[PDB]
Amino acid sequence: DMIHDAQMDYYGTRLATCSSDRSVKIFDVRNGGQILIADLRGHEGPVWQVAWAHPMYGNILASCSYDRKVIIWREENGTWEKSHEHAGHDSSVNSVCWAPHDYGLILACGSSDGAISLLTYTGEGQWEVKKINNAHTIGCNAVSWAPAVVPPSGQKPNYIKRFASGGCDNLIKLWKEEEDGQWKEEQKLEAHSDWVRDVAWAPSIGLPTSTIASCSQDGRVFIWTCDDASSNTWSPKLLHKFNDVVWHVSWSITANILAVSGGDNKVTLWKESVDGQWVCISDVN
């Protein structure tokens, strides 16, 4: 009937769709032609978000549902069997995304009972679930990692370690890591008035000014950007203010055009001008 989130695969290949009928359909797009391949079904609740993995670790695609469980099925030799299954959450899952392509196979999924998840695959498939509780006041609703931030020998290059999450209590920013057991998040930023819907970080195209967009239920779209690297500055900029609530908010990779999806069942493309103010490009549909 009504779909929730439908993200593409790699280089415009398949299109894993998710609706409210507990059906994770993986449709193929060949020269603009939509064609279904398989229908992964095995959840008691409605499917929410879905994110595909990188092509270096085969062909994995994780999808969240409302049955307090996370399914991660593979795709090889026409067999879309469910590989790993993580059910460490207490309530339903809202958002579920993966890390970078160079981070192996790390996926972060947020729950609704004030907790999250972080499945890190090892050398075989033993996902070490290291989660807890006490997150936001109502739970999580947004989960998206930031850009692949880089760190002189001749082996595996370093990056920035793993540390990313997101709540719904009018607080959505990045996080910091360390050199101990896991990571110690440190990035407090509050500028919203109601429940935060979606919050996707913008991918950096080589520049150090990393930005992060967010959308709440009040109708405002904040764009929090940093001044420099390793600086204590998280000033947010209001892009637009609508009368209705916003759903999701995606960003492009070339010009980093913000795709504001929400309001009156219409998507709008926002792009930063030379003066610094965000203006609407055109209207979708």
């Binding site: 890390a99 160079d102 930031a146 370690k161 360390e178 990035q187 970080w201 390793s230 204590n232």
Partner: protein, 84 residues
């Protein structure tokens, strides 16, 4: 502010490790309050028992047997991105 302080401490520790002052870096981390970081950095030496190894007989046994596990954890942390 705490994130910036942690980033500065990590940069100072990396600079000390590149210069060649592991003991000084461990002392600075212990004085700052990074006991876990100091314990993880001190685990680079292998296990050396004074009763088994008769060549380098010292006082107490120093080292750890999870050197490969620590190396794999460090490699995974270096592979992970978007944080510190």
């Amino acid at each position: 502010l705490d994130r910036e302080d942690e980033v500065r401490l990590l940069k100072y520790l990396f600079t000390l490790i590149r210069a060649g002052m592991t003991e000084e870096a461990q002392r600075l981390c212990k004085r700052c309050g990074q006991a876990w970081r100091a314990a993880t950095l001190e685990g680079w030496k292998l296990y050396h028992d004074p009763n088994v190894n008769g060549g380098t007989e010292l006082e107490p046994v120093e080292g750890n047997p999870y050197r490969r596990i620590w190396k794999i954890s460090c490699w995974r942390m270096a592979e992970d991105e978007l944080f510190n």
